Structure formats: C-alpha cells, structure tokens
Design a protein around this ligand. Structure first.
Ligand code: HEM
Ligand SMILES: OC[C@H]1O[C@@](CO)(O[C@H]2O[C@H](CO)[C@@H](O)[C@H](O)[C@H]2O)[C@@H](O)[C@@H]1O
Ligand SMILES: Clc1ccc(-c2cnc[nH]2)cc1
Ligand SMILES: Clc1ccc(-c2cnc[nH]2)cc1
Length: 464
C-alpha cells in the first residue's frame, strides 16, 4: 500500500539508511534502490519522497488538491506552529493565502508601484557600493537590505535605512536562523525532536531568534493600531487589523492576533532570506564564470545603455540575462528537499495508497537537476535556458518556486526583484575578488531545508 522503501527499525526509523551528507544525499541513495516514489521513516513518521519532474508533477499538478496539504518542519514548529499563510492547512490556509495575495496586490504586487520601489532600492544599492570604492566586501547584509525593504514596504509600511541598528539585528537573526534551519543539526532534529528537544542544540537558538523577531513584529503591530486610520490602511498589517475588527463578531474567524503575528513573521522571513540568498549565489557564480557576466553586461549595453534604470519590460528583450537568472535559480537550488506537503485525503498514487495526512516531500532539487531536461545538470550553464536561436527556453522541470496549489505566493515579486537587482548592479559595476575563478567554491555552506552559499568577499568596481 505505501510506496516501497527500506524496512524501518523501532525507535531509529530509517536512520541506518541515512547519510551524514544530509537528507538530500540520503534520499538520493535510497532512490537508486527503490525508484522515484518511495517511503522513508523519519523517526517513526512515514514520509513519501517524490523524485524527478514527472513524479513531482503527477502529484502536485495532476492531483493538485490531494497533495495541497502542508506538513511540518520540527525545528520551527515551536514558534510558528501552523499559523499564517505558509504552514497552515484547510480553511485557514485557503482564507489566509487568498487574503495575502489580494492584500499584497493592493499595495503594489505585480504593479508599477512595487516596480518603482525596487528601482528605487537598486539605486540606493548602487550609491552604497560606490562609497566602498573597489574595496572588497561581504554582500550578505546589503542583499538582505534591498529585498527586505520591498516586503517591509508592503507589510510594515516603511523601508529602513542600511544603518538602522534594529534593522541590522533583525537581518542578522534571519541569516543565522536560515543557516541553522539548514544545518545537519536541524535534520537530525527532524528525526528525533521528541528526544533532542530536552537538550541544548540548533533548535533552541532557532526558537530564540524567531522569538526575538516576533517581539519586533509585536511592537510593530501595536504601533500600527495606534495610528490606524480605518479609511486609509497603509499596509498589510492595517488591512489585517481592519478585517480583524470587523470579524470580532464571528468566534471562529481566522483573523485573530496569533495568525497576524505569524502571517507577518512568515512574509518578513522569506522576503529577507530567499531572493537575497539567490542573488548572493548569483554573484559568486559571476565570480566563477566572468565570461557570463561580460555577456550579461554586453546585453545590458545593447538594450538599456549605461544610464537609464532597467525595467521589467527590458527583460523581455534580454533573453540571455533572463536565461542566466533562470540558471542561477536552477543551480542555487534554494529549497532542495522542497517543502513538506501531506495528503488531505486517502489518496491513490501510482498504485499506492497514501492515507490521509501522510507527509510528502517533493524533492524539487531532482527536478532542477533532472538529466532528461538539462544536459549537464551539475554544471552552471545559461544554455540550459537558451534555444538554438538564443531565445529563452522554458522548462517544465524549472520549479524553484514549486508547483500546484501551494506554489510560492511571492514568485512574481521574487522574479522581478532578481531581474531588476541583478541587471542594475551589473549595469553599474563589474565584480572581482582575491580568489581565482577556478578556486571559487560553489558547494553549499549548509544544505538542508534550505541551501546557502559559502561565505565570500566581493569587489564592486565602476566600469569606466
Ligand atoms: C527566490 C525566492 C523564493 C523562492 C525560490 C520561493 C520558493 C518557495 C517555495 C519552494 C515554496 C514552497 C512551495 C510548496 O510548498 O510547495 C514557497 C512558499 C511560499 N512562499 Fe516563496 N519563495 C520565494 C520568495 C518568496 C517571497 C518573496 C514571498 C513573499 C513575499 C514568498 C512567499 C511564500 C509564501 C506565502 C509561500 C507559501 C505558499 C503556500 O503555502 O500557499 N516567497 N516559496
Ligand atoms: O517556470 C516554469 C514553471 O513555473 C510555473 C509556475 O510558477 O509556470 C506556470 O505558468 C507557466 C507560464 O506559462 C505555465 O507554463 C506553467 O504551465 C504554469 O504552471 C510552472 O507551471 C512551470 O513549470
Ligand atoms: Cl519560516 C519561513 C517562511 C517562509 C519561507 C519561504 C517562502 N518562500 C520561500 N521561502 C521559508 C521559511
Ligand atoms: Cl513551507 C516552506 C518551507 C521552507 C521553504 C524554504 C526552503 N528553503 C528556502 N525556503 C519554503 C516554504
């Protein structure tokens, strides 16, 4: 009945078939033995893994509803639980995703206003790197600044200065937490939290970090109440507050205080740590393959020039840069073991019966590195997204934002951020570092529920 897999042991589950290389390396080895759809017991819990573009789509697209449930990540479950639009299920999920989409669009998502804020934020970024004057720097903080300011403007109603001390702290917390979430420790914790939770570990520092961020969120929510004008909501929080007051009538409403706190935390995270991390890998990749960079700048020069601000319309006439960004996303592989799903009802899949609430991991990494769709999946090559004519070549295998009903809410804003921030930085600068291109290390610094590049230093030099 469940998909096949290695026989589990009492207590240990399938620990014996696990690998110290982490979940992804482990699952890859079990797949060779049991095929594309198989079962691994994480501690006592059966989890169905789905490998390859075809298996992943057959589930998340062809039985979209059955595979639309949300599973759990043990290490963020203490603080986050199943509140907000991301880790919720059923009517709460349906209500909060719809609410969040509608609301983000009211404050600009997919419209000229957010396009302008990204342009404005890029211009702030260029001015800051000119002040550095060649000098090598670690771009982690700035890449976080520029992406967080876009979501902050939609959620908190403001952007923050690059030297704001409380902004620095929050971004430090986000970076450290995403890495901690991605560490070998969190994976071991996913197996054995019932036992490990009593002891020191990554899981504890993650609860503390998330709680410190949640304090800031609480502060911001209170201050939103004080200045709340019911006929001009400035942002996501106000809009939520207004709906909250209106629905105090219903006792089973989803719009309560906890869903607000966690809704904001969810959006704040992931708007600080996703596009930001992708970008950071992008320029490490630009350091390793400078010929790719030059070919991007040459296309910038032809389509845009060296002075006007890039626009989203410019991307449609820039297939090569677009392909490069696709390839940066395919390679950097932000969410490898995907994100935990589960089936909402008893489900028949490839002759298997998955009982209701069975966890399901769509191994997105196996789609992004699918050999039937990409000639050399382990290598960074823009040609994976170019056809013979040099036009942008789409791929069903390209699912860095996943697919189906749970598909990333921020896909649009993330694609637009990546294009505008990437294309604007290379318009004004070229990049270099002490480290020889052949010595550039592309192995992840942490690989787990997220993928994080190695730390590096980089120089932004004006190009005459
Ligand atoms: C490169 C940037 C991003 C990537 C690669 C990305 C990727 C993903 C992935 C893989 C998921 C899980 C989908 C699944 O469960 O199957 C997800 C979910 C989600 N993302 Fe993103 N995301 C990115 C940026 C953002 C941004 C900027 C936002 C909002 C500002 C955002 C909001 C969300 C939300 C709300 C969900 C949960 C969707 C749901 O459960 O309905 N993400 N994202
Ligand atoms: O990047 C391709 C990948 O993204 C998705 C969902 O984000 O694109 C959706 O919109 C596409 C644009 O045409 C459609 O082709 C695609 O069918 C649609 O689902 C995935 O679907 C697609 O694999
Ligand atoms: Cl706690 C948390 C919240 C959101 C994400 C996310 C959404 N889309 C991409 N990453 C990751 C982790
Ligand atoms: Cl529900 C969920 C969980 C994790 C992520 C993620 C992994 N890596 C980055 N973001 C996204 C969505």
């Amino acid at each position: 009945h469940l998909p096949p897999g290695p026989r589990p042991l009492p207590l240990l589950g399938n620990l014996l078939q696990m690998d110290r290389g982490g979940f992804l390396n482990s699952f890859m080895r079990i797949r060779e033995k049991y095929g594309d759809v198989f079962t691994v017991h994480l501690g006592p819990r059966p989890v169905v893994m789905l490998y390859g573009t075809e298996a992943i789509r057959e589930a998340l697209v062809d039985q979209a509803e059955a595979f639309s449930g949300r599973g759990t990540i043990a290490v963020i479950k203490p603080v986050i639980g199943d509140y907000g639009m991301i880790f919720s299920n059923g009517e709460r999920w349906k209500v909060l995703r719809r609410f969040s989409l509608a609301t983000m669009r009211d404050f600009g998502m997919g419209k000229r206003s957010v396009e302008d804020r990204i342009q404005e934020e890029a211009q702030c970024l260029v001015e800051e790197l000119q002040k550095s004057q060649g000098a090598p720097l670690d771009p982690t903080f700035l890449f976080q600044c520029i992406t967080a300011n876009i979501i902050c403007s939609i959620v908190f109603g403001e952007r923050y200065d690059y030297k704001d001390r409380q902004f620095l702290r929050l971004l430090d917390l986000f970076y450290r937490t995403f890495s901690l979430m991605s560490s070998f420790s969190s994976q071991v914790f996913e197996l054995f939290s019932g036992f490990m939770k009593y002891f020191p570990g990554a899981h504890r520092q993650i609860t503390r970090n998330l709680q410190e961020i949640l304090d800031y969120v609480g502060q911001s929510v209170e201050k939103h109440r004080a200045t709340l004008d019911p006929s001009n909501p400035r942002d996501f929080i106000d809009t939520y507050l207004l709906r909250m007051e209106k629905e105090k009538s219903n006792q089973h409403t989803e719009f309560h205080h906890q869903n607000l706190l966690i809704s904001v935390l969810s959006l704040f995270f992931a708007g600080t740590e996703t596009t930001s991390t992708t970008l950071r890998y992008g320029f490490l990749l630009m350091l390793k393959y400078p010929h790719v960079a030059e070919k991007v700048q040459k296309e910038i020069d032809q389509v845009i020039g060296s002075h006007r601000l890039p626009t989203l319309e410019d991307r449609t006439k820039m297939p090569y840069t677009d392909a490069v960004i696709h390839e940066i996303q395919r390679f950097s592989d932000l969410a490898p073991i995907g994100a935990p799903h589960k089936v909402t009802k008893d489900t028949l899949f490839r002759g298997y019966l998955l009982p209701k609430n069975t966890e399901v991991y769509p191994i997105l990494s196996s789609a992004l590195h699918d050999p039937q769709y990409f000639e050399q999946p382990g290598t960074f090559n823009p040609d994976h997204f170019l056809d013979a004519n040099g036009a942008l070549k789409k791929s069903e295998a390209f699912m860095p934002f996943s697919i189906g009903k749970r598909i990333c809410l921020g896909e649009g804003i993330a694609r637009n951020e990546l294009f505008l921030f990437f294309t604007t930085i290379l318009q004004n600068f070229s990049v270099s570092s002490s480290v020889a291109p052949k010595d550039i290390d592309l192995s992840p610094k942490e690989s787990g529920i997220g993928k994080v590049p190695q730390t590096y230093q980089i120089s932004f030099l004006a190009r005459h």
